[PDB]
Structure formats: structure tokens, C-alpha cells
Amino acid sequence: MRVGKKIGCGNFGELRLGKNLYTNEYVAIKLEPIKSRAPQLHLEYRFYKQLGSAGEGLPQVYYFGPCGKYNAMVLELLGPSLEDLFDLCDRTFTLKTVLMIAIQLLSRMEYVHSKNLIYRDVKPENFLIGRQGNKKEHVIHIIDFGLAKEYIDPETKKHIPYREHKSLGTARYMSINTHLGKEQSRRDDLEALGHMFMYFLRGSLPWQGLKADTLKERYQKIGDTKRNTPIEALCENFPEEMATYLRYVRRLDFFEKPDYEYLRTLFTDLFEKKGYTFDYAYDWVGRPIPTPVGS
Ligand SMILES: CC(C)n1cnc2/c(=N/c3cccc(Cl)c3)nc(NCCO)[nH]c21
Ligand SMILES: CC(C)n1cnc2/c(=N/c3cccc(Cl)c3)nc(NCCO)[nH]c21
Ligand SMILES: CC(C)n1cnc2/c(=N/c3cccc(Cl)c3)nc(NCCO)[nH]c21
């Protein structure tokens, strides 16, 4: 409605509706308290700037600066997330929808990697369609670069070294090697995507809803269960290509450049085999799509 409206409640701050005075267009204002003892917003801004707004499926970024008691980052206003659309579609997606998502997100993640960044926060909440009117509703955008990292050193142009005993993104989708505390690299982004694709097809993953003693133990139980769930069991009654995908990405080496084209062709060949047309008729098309604003 009017600018200044709260349009999102984030983990580190909030999201408000703004206007671009140059165009009269609505924009998104991401806010983080200046008092934050774990500031993330400026890091994110710097990453967005390294990516640029050239490659498709990245929000345009306009501004970073202090705004009252907040730091403010202003960027392109988008539509709902894949998780919201998953909820709208009663928490399963068709194969056709999942393949259209997968093919696009493989290009998106490749682009991110091409800019020397690893993403490290794959989850459905972080992939948003464009707004309805704005003719980019078919485009799946990647957002939230707060957990990202430069994996090629700017100075030496060398890949970051291998390391262990690391922190611990989001437990539901993270790679097995992330659970083991290994430094994440390009492979881990692709494995998390694969877990997300299987989440969409199945409706859930078998390491969801586990009970723990503490956060530490839940991460442990989830990681243990991922290892104990064979890909064959995980992908039972879905096309073999899903299992082929998971095997490939699980078997990538730390420094290895993924063959993104191989993975996209795996899904495109299945897409053609099934007789599907890439018409952007996702499952949610024809349903009432949430919109952040009208005008
Ligand atoms: C690039 C980031 C800062 N960005 C841009 N647009 C959005 C966004 N748009 C909304 C917000 C509320 C409802 C809807 Cl349908 C879209 N939501 C979110 N997050 C969900 C908060 O409601 N992030 C957005
Ligand atoms: C009335 C308030 C809620 N409002 C409305 N629109 C904006 C706003 N819009 C911007 C700021 C920078 C670039 C662009 Cl394109 C829009 N920014 C801000 N704050 C960031 C710049 O001070 N506030 C805005
Ligand atoms: C691209 C830049 C010049 N730009 C475009 N629109 C804005 C902007 N929009 C506002 C701010 C306050 C109220 C309203 Cl309605 C819009 N604010 C700001 N504030 C930050 C200083 O420019 N910048 C804006």
C-alpha cells in the first residue's frame, strides 16, 4: 500500500516498502539495526555488487546507507519464494515444475560461481519469482547473500584451501560434507540444490522432524540420517536422473569445477523424454499469487 509498510520480518531485521523517486516504482528496503552485534547487511551489499545486476535472476541493487536506527539496503522488489509457492501448491510440485526450477537454478548457481562466490544458504525461502506485473514472474531469482564467501582469493587467484572443524547454513538441505564440518565449496551448493529438488518432488525429506537433546544433536541426527539414507531409497519412484544428479554432486572433489552443463542436460533430456514444453507453466500458474503491492 503506502511506502513505509512492513512487508517482511527477517532473522536480522525487517523489510519495508519504498519508492524509487526516479521511476515511481516500488522497491524493497532491507533493514538491519545499527546496534546489531552480528552485522550482515553490508557484507551482503558487497557481494551483490560483486555479482552485478547483468546476469538474469539477480535483483537489482540501488543503495546502501544509514537510515535512522537502521542500516538500509535498497533493491528490486520481487514476488513470493519457492517455499511460499510450495505451500500454495499444497506441498508437492510436479516433475515438470521441479525440472523447470532445477534447470534455471543450475544456471543461476553457475553464474554465482563464475563471479568467484559460493552461496552456502540454499533453501526454498531464498529463491523468489519476479512480481506478476513486471513480466519477470517466470524468472527465479537468488537472494540473501549474507552467508556467501569468495572461494577464489582475489590476490592469488587461487581457490581457497581445504579445511575442517567448521561452524555449521540450513540443516535440512546442507551437504553431507557440510555436516562433517568441512570447508564448503562449489559442490556443496549443488548438493543442497539436489536435496531441495527431492524435497519438492517427495513433499518432504526423511531427515525432517527428528528429535534432539540440543541444536548440536539435531544437526548430528540430520547428518547421520542423510548418510544412512541411500540415494536409491531417497529417489525411489522418481526418475533415475535425480539419483544420477545426487551421485555426481556427492562425488565431486573439493577443488573440482562442476560440469553444470552435464547436470542441466541430464534434466533437459528427461524433460524432453517426458514430452514437456518449457512454457513456464509452473504448478502455481492459475493459482492466486501473493503480491507485495498493487499499483
Ligand atoms: C531481494 C529481497 C530483499 N527481496 C525483494 N523482494 C522481496 C520480497 N517481496 C515480497 C514480500 C512480501 C510478500 C511478497 Cl508476495 C513478496 N520478500 C522478501 N523476503 C520475504 C519477506 O516478506 N525479500 C525480497
Ligand atoms: C518513506 C521511506 C519508507 N522510504 C520510501 N522510499 C524509500 C527509499 N527509497 C530508495 C532509496 C534509495 C534508492 C532507491 Cl531506488 C529508493 N529509501 C529509504 N531509505 C533508504 C535511503 O535513506 N526510505 C524510503
Ligand atoms: C536513486 C536515489 C537518488 N533514490 C531514488 N529514490 C530515493 C529515495 N526515495 C524516497 C525517500 C523518502 C521518501 C520517499 Cl517517498 C522516497 N530516497 C533516497 N534516499 C537516499 C539519498 O538519495 N534515494 C533515492
Side-chain angles (χ1 to χ4, degrees), residues 1-34 36-45 47-134 136-154 156 159-165 168-210 212 215 219-220 222-226 228-231 233-235 237-272 274-294:
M1 32 283 89
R2 286 193 186 278
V3 296
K5 180 70 174 189
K6 179 177 175 167
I7 62 167
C9 253
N11 301 151
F12 297 97
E14 70 192 73
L15 193 66
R16 285 189 199 164
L17 194 59
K19 178 164 67 173
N20 180 351
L21 297 172
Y22 292 171
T23 64
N24 301 328
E25 295 300 322
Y26 288 108
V27 296
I29 309 166
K30 196 176 178 176
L31 300 171
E32 179 181 80
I34 289 178
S36 181
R37 306 281 190 71
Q40 204 192 247
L41 194 67
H42 205 171
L43 283 169
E44 189 172 16
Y45 178 68
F47 290 139
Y48 272 124
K49 296 321 271 187
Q50 276 191 252
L51 290 159
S53 324
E56 199 171 54
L58 323 173
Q60 301 204 314
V61 179
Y62 304 117
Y63 183 88
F64 181 94
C67 175
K69 73 183 177 177
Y70 304 99
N71 279 308
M73 185 175 54
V74 183
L75 49 184
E76 186 173 11
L77 182 67
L78 305 172
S81 77
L82 290 183
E83 181 66 13
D84 302 327
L85 296 162
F86 192 52
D87 283 329
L88 179 70
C89 296
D90 305 312
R91 300 185 65 75
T92 66
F93 287 147
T94 61
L95 183 55
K96 177 183 174 178
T97 285
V98 174
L99 294 174
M100 289 192 302
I101 294 170
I103 287 161
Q104 239 201 119
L105 289 189
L106 284 163
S107 298
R108 200 75 62 250
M109 197 62 68
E110 180 170 13
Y111 181 84
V112 173
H113 296 170
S114 85
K115 296 299 201 168
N116 289 353
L117 298 187
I118 51 177
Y119 180 62
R120 310 193 302 170
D121 201 26
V122 168
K123 57 174 156 200
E125 292 86 342
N126 290 349
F127 298 108
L128 278 53
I129 62 174
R131 289 212 270 146
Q132 290 296 105
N134 291 40
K136 290 192 189 176
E137 329 87 285
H138 67 281
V139 181
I140 304 175
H141 300 72
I142 186 166
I143 68 160
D144 201 347
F145 284 83
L147 289 182
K149 184 168 178 172
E150 210 165 2
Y151 74 89
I152 303 300
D153 182 79
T156 67
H159 193 289
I160 56 172
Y162 178 75
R163 288 195 212 179
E164 303 189 348
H165 304 101
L168 283 73
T170 302
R172 189 187 299 164
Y173 315 98
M174 65 172 53
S175 68
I176 290 177
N177 282 330
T178 304
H179 277 279
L180 302 174
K182 298 173 182 177
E183 187 76 49
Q184 297 172 63
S185 65
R186 295 175 277 197
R187 61 189 185 175
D188 301 290
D189 284 341
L190 299 186
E191 181 176 336
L193 284 176
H195 289 147
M196 195 183 64
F197 304 151
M198 288 315 297
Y199 168 81
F200 291 152
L201 288 168
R202 293 163 58 80
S204 71
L205 293 162
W207 46 81
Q208 281 178 240
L210 302 181
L215 177 60
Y219 275 113
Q220 181 63 35
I222 292 167
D224 290 354
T225 299
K226 280 168 186 180
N228 294 340
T229 304
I231 294 169
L234 184 67
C235 308
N237 301 71
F238 299 96
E240 243 293 323
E241 286 84 352
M242 307 314 310
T244 304
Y245 180 97
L246 277 179
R247 283 189 214 104
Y248 173 93
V249 301
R250 290 263 183 97
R251 291 170 179 171
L252 280 169
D253 299 320
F254 177 74
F255 296 99
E256 191 169 6
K257 179 160 149 68
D259 187 336
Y260 305 91
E261 188 53 30
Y262 165 73
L263 297 174
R264 281 195 294 274
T265 304
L266 198 63
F267 292 148
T268 301
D269 285 350
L270 178 56
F271 196 87
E272 294 167 8
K274 293 283 181 177
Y276 301 151
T277 302
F278 214 116
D279 57 7
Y280 299 105
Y282 303 104
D283 297 343
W284 53 85
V285 174
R287 305 208 180 211
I289 307 302
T291 129
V293 60

